[PDB]
Amino acid sequence: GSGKVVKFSYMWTINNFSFCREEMGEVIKSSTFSSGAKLKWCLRVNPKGLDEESKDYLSLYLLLVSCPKSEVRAKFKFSILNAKGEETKAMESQRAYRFVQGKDWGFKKFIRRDFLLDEANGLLPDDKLTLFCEVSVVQD
Amino acid sequence: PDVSSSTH
Protein backbone atom coordinates (compact mmCIF):
# COMPACT_ATOMS: atom_id res chain seq x y z
CA GLY A 1 0.00 0.00 0.00
CA SER A 2 1.58 3.22 -1.34
CA GLY A 3 0.27 6.16 0.70
CA LYS A 4 1.03 9.80 1.57
CA VAL A 5 -0.15 12.47 4.00
CA VAL A 6 -1.14 15.12 1.48
CA LYS A 7 -2.96 17.54 3.82
CA PHE A 8 -2.83 18.47 7.48
CA SER A 9 -3.91 21.19 9.88
CA TYR A 10 -1.85 22.40 12.80
CA MET A 11 -3.49 24.32 15.63
CA TRP A 12 -1.24 26.46 17.85
CA THR A 13 -2.19 28.40 20.98
CA ILE A 14 -0.02 31.13 22.47
CA ASN A 15 -1.07 31.82 26.07
CA ASN A 16 -0.87 35.25 27.74
CA PHE A 17 -0.28 36.75 24.30
CA SER A 18 -0.29 40.28 25.76
CA PHE A 19 2.72 39.20 27.88
CA CYS A 20 4.66 38.50 24.67
CA ARG A 21 6.71 41.68 24.59
CA GLU A 22 9.18 40.54 21.88
CA GLU A 23 10.23 43.58 19.82
CA MET A 24 10.07 44.08 16.04
CA GLY A 25 12.00 41.28 14.39
CA GLU A 26 12.05 39.07 17.47
CA VAL A 27 10.31 35.72 16.97
CA ILE A 28 8.29 32.98 18.67
CA LYS A 29 8.76 29.47 17.35
CA SER A 30 6.24 26.69 17.87
CA SER A 31 7.48 23.20 18.64
CA THR A 32 8.37 21.17 15.56
CA PHE A 33 5.64 18.99 14.06
CA SER A 34 5.89 16.28 11.40
CA SER A 35 3.68 15.07 8.55
CA GLY A 36 3.47 11.57 8.07
CA ALA A 37 4.28 8.22 6.49
CA LYS A 38 9.07 12.32 6.55
CA LEU A 39 8.54 16.07 6.63
CA LYS A 40 9.20 18.26 9.64
CA TRP A 41 7.78 21.78 10.13
CA CYS A 42 7.36 24.56 12.67
CA LEU A 43 5.59 27.91 12.83
CA ARG A 44 7.15 31.29 13.52
CA VAL A 45 5.33 34.42 14.57
CA ASN A 46 6.69 37.93 15.10
CA PRO A 47 4.33 39.45 17.70
CA LYS A 48 5.55 42.90 16.72
CA GLY A 49 6.41 42.56 13.06
CA LEU A 50 9.42 41.20 11.28
CA ASP A 51 10.41 44.69 10.16
CA GLU A 52 9.47 48.36 9.72
CA GLU A 53 7.22 47.53 6.79
CA SER A 54 5.28 45.38 9.25
CA LYS A 55 5.85 47.29 12.51
CA ASP A 56 2.10 47.39 13.20
CA TYR A 57 1.58 43.79 12.20
CA LEU A 58 2.02 40.32 13.56
CA SER A 59 4.04 38.26 11.05
CA LEU A 60 3.27 34.59 10.50
CA TYR A 61 5.44 31.94 8.84
CA LEU A 62 5.56 28.24 8.03
CA LEU A 63 9.07 26.74 8.19
CA LEU A 64 10.20 23.49 6.56
CA VAL A 65 12.58 21.94 9.11
CA SER A 66 13.43 18.82 7.13
CA CYS A 67 12.53 16.87 4.02
CA PRO A 68 13.91 13.70 2.43
CA LYS A 69 14.64 15.36 -0.92
CA SER A 70 15.93 18.74 -2.08
CA GLU A 71 12.57 20.48 -1.67
CA VAL A 72 8.86 20.36 -0.88
CA ARG A 73 6.05 22.22 -2.70
CA ALA A 74 3.03 23.34 -0.70
CA LYS A 75 -0.01 25.59 -0.46
CA PHE A 76 -0.92 26.93 2.97
CA LYS A 77 -3.56 28.93 4.76
CA PHE A 78 -3.25 30.74 8.09
CA SER A 79 -6.22 31.89 10.15
CA ILE A 80 -7.17 32.70 13.72
CA LEU A 81 -9.75 30.76 15.73
CA ASN A 82 -12.07 33.09 17.62
CA ALA A 83 -13.90 32.89 20.95
CA LYS A 84 -16.68 30.83 19.37
CA GLY A 85 -14.12 28.48 17.83
CA GLU A 86 -14.80 29.72 14.30
CA GLU A 87 -12.17 30.69 11.70
CA THR A 88 -11.50 34.33 10.93
CA LYS A 89 -8.85 36.51 9.33
CA ALA A 90 -7.84 33.74 6.98
CA MET A 91 -5.12 34.39 4.40
CA GLU A 92 -3.94 31.74 1.98
CA SER A 93 -1.00 31.28 -0.34
CA GLN A 94 -2.63 31.63 -3.75
CA ARG A 95 -0.32 29.06 -5.26
CA ALA A 96 2.06 26.46 -3.85
CA TYR A 97 5.48 27.66 -2.76
CA ARG A 98 8.86 25.96 -2.94
CA PHE A 99 10.16 25.09 0.54
CA VAL A 100 13.67 23.80 1.17
CA GLN A 101 15.27 22.84 4.49
CA GLY A 102 15.45 25.76 6.87
CA LYS A 103 13.38 28.06 4.65
CA ASP A 104 9.98 29.53 5.50
CA TRP A 105 7.07 31.25 3.75
CA GLY A 106 4.14 33.20 5.17
CA PHE A 107 2.56 36.61 5.64
CA LYS A 108 4.62 39.56 6.90
CA LYS A 109 1.43 41.54 7.58
CA PHE A 110 -1.02 38.80 8.59
CA ILE A 111 -3.01 40.96 11.02
CA ARG A 112 -2.74 44.34 12.72
CA ARG A 113 -1.81 44.38 16.40
CA ASP A 114 -4.31 47.10 17.27
CA PHE A 115 -7.10 45.11 15.70
CA LEU A 116 -6.14 42.02 17.65
CA LEU A 117 -6.08 44.08 20.88
CA ASP A 118 -9.33 45.94 20.20
CA GLU A 119 -11.14 42.64 19.64
CA ALA A 120 -9.32 40.90 22.53
CA ASN A 121 -12.62 39.64 23.95
CA GLY A 122 -13.26 37.71 20.73
CA LEU A 123 -9.78 37.07 19.30
CA LEU A 124 -7.85 36.63 22.56
CA PRO A 125 -10.14 34.68 24.93
CA ASP A 126 -8.37 34.42 28.30
CA ASP A 127 -5.61 36.30 26.50
CA LYS A 128 -4.88 33.23 24.38
CA LEU A 129 -4.13 33.49 20.67
CA THR A 130 -5.05 30.36 18.73
CA LEU A 131 -3.60 30.07 15.25
CA PHE A 132 -4.66 27.60 12.59
CA CYS A 133 -2.44 26.50 9.69
CA GLU A 134 -3.81 24.23 6.98
CA VAL A 135 -1.18 22.88 4.56
CA SER A 136 -1.45 21.08 1.21
CA VAL A 137 1.66 19.15 0.26
CA VAL A 138 1.77 18.65 -3.48
CA GLN A 139 5.31 17.33 -3.89
CA ASP A 140 7.74 15.61 -1.61
CA PRO B 1 0.14 37.60 -3.67
CA ASP B 2 2.49 39.07 -1.05
CA VAL B 3 3.76 35.90 0.52
CA SER B 4 7.33 36.33 1.69
CA SER B 5 10.11 34.56 3.59
CA SER B 6 11.67 35.62 6.89
CA THR B 7 14.53 33.11 6.63
CA HIS B 8 15.63 33.86 3.08
Q: Residue A26: closest CA among chain B residues belongs to which residue?
A: B6
Is A123 exposed, middle or buried, given 0-12, 13-18 or 19+ CB atoms closer than 10 A?
buried
Q: What are phi and psi of A139, to 5 degrees?
A: -165, 135
Give the start-to-end residue ranges of the domains of chain A: 5-140
Tell me, which fold does domain A5-140 have in CATH? 2.60.210
Method used to solve the structure: X-ray
Nearest to B7 among A59, A102, A108 (CB): A102
Candidates B2, B4, B6, B7: best to mutate against A (most CBs of A within 10 A) is B6
Residues in chain A closer than 8 A to B2 (CB atoms): 107-109
- By DSSP bridging, strand A72-81 and strand A97-99 are antiparallel
**Residues with Cβ < 8 Å from A107, sequence gap 6 or more?**
A59, A60, A61, A78, A91, B2, B3, B4
- A99 exposure class (CB count in 10 Å sphere: 0-12, 13-18, 19+): buried
The reported resolution of this PDB entry, expressed in Å, is 2.1
Chains A, B: CB pairs < 8 Å = 35
Q: Which residues of A touch B4 (CB under 8 A)?
A: 105-108
Q: Give kind and range of the element (H or E) at residue A106.
A: strand A104-112
Burial class (CB in 10 A: 0-12, 13-18, 19+), A110: buried
Q: Among all residues of chain B, which has the CA nearest to that of A60?
A: B6
A125 CA to chain B: closest CA distance, Å? 28
User: Which amino acid is residue B8, in one-letter code?
Assistant: H
Q: A37: number of CA atoms within 13 Å, CB side?
A: 10
Nearest-neighbour CA in chain B from A108: distance (Å):
7
Q: How far is CA A5 from the centre of its chain?
A: 19
Eight-state DSSP code of residue A31: P
